[PDB]
Amino acid sequence: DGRYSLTYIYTGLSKHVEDVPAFQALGSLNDLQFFRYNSKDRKSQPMGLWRQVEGMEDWKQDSQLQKAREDIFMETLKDIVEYYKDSTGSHVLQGRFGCEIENNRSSGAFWKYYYDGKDYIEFNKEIPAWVPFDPAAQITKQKWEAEPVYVQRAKAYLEEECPATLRKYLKYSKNILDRQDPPSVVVTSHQAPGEKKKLKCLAYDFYPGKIDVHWTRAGEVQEPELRGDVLHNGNGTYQSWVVVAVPPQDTAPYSCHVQHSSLAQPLVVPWEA
Numbered sequence: 001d002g003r004y005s006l007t008y009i010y011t012g013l014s015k016h017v018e019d020v021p022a023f024q025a026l027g028s029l030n031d032l033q034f035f036r037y038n039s040k041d042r043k044s045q046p047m048g049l050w051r052q053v054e055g056m057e058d059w060k061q062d063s064q065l066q067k068a069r070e071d072i073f074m075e076t077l078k079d080i081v082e083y084y085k086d087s088t089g090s091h092v093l094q095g096r097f098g099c100e101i102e103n104n105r106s107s108g109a110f111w112k113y114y115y116d117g118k119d120y121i122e123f124n125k126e127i128p129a130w131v132p133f134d135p136a137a138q139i140t141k142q143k144w145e146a147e148p149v150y151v152q153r154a155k156a157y158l159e160e161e162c163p164a165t166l167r168k169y170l171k172y173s174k175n176i177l178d179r180q181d182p183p184s185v186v187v188t189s190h191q192a193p194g195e196k197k198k199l200k201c202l203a204y205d206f207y208p209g210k211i212d213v214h215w216t217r218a219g220e221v222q223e224p225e226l227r228g229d230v231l232h233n234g235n236g237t238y239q240s241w242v243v244v245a246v247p248p249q250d251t252a253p254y255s256c257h258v259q260h261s262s263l264a265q266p267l268v269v270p271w272e273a
């Protein structure tokens, strides 16, 4: 088996402006986002290729869960501002948590918070306890450890529930995270009035993202003039391109090359002037 990670990111603003939700949550599985939730619509919604996966999660229920998470989160943000006596200001609290497995074996877990961008508090499951980094965190810690169960629960969340959720999801996501969709390529050219002719090699509809794309001028690998790539989350696919400018009198042979993990051997696509 390989590496898999389940990450969540919560964002809360103490004085949100118009059109910006006070609370936002999102979740990822590896390099893809599978869900989202904000305090405006208050609904946990699958995203990307997960919008088509059935029976992996009861979104209606997970929404009740996010609403409850939101309440605690925003109360936390509220208490920090109350502590700095600055409710007139605009502040942010960000949370990060999740885990990762490698070869079906839990390989890591994390739970950390940031206030106005600085480390606020984080959970150390080995102790187990919260570690304050900011003075107001001393209060927060006192609250999250007011009963013996609490840390026990937090430790149980990272060591048992989270990795269980991740495994459950992997069961329904093989057709998503384990894909090896081969790249479709397209060589194209454009002549800018006054400029040289440029050739653009495009690799698309492929996954995983790791890919090798380069041109060759007479069997000679060229230095790209431009270069970019993108991940279309709704699709779960990448696109990577390269662009070379060609001398207005060059006659040499131009061919594009693509190497990807899903290919038994590299691909070549010459440009026919």
Ligand SMILES: *[C@@H]1O[C@H](CO)[C@@H](O[C@@H]2O[C@H](CO)[C@@H](O)[C@H](O)[C@H]2NC(C)=O)[C@H](O)[C@H]1NC(C)=O
Pocket (backbone or CB within 6 Å): 205, 232, 235, 237, 239
């Ligand atoms: C995945 O989504 C991307 C982005 O929506 C698709 O790319 C678009 O494809 C259409 C027609 O093929 C083009 O007209 C658009 O210009 C493309 N968007 C851009 C700017 O990248 C892609 O085709 C989708 N792949 C699959 C397999 O559905």
Ligand SMILES: *[C@@H]1O[C@H](CO)[C@@H](O)[C@H](O)[C@H]1NC(C)=O
Pocket (backbone or CB within 6 Å): 104
């Ligand atoms: C790991 O995968 C096995 C099958 O490969 C599964 O039965 C098990 O529940 C998973 N996690 C463990 C070791 O509990």
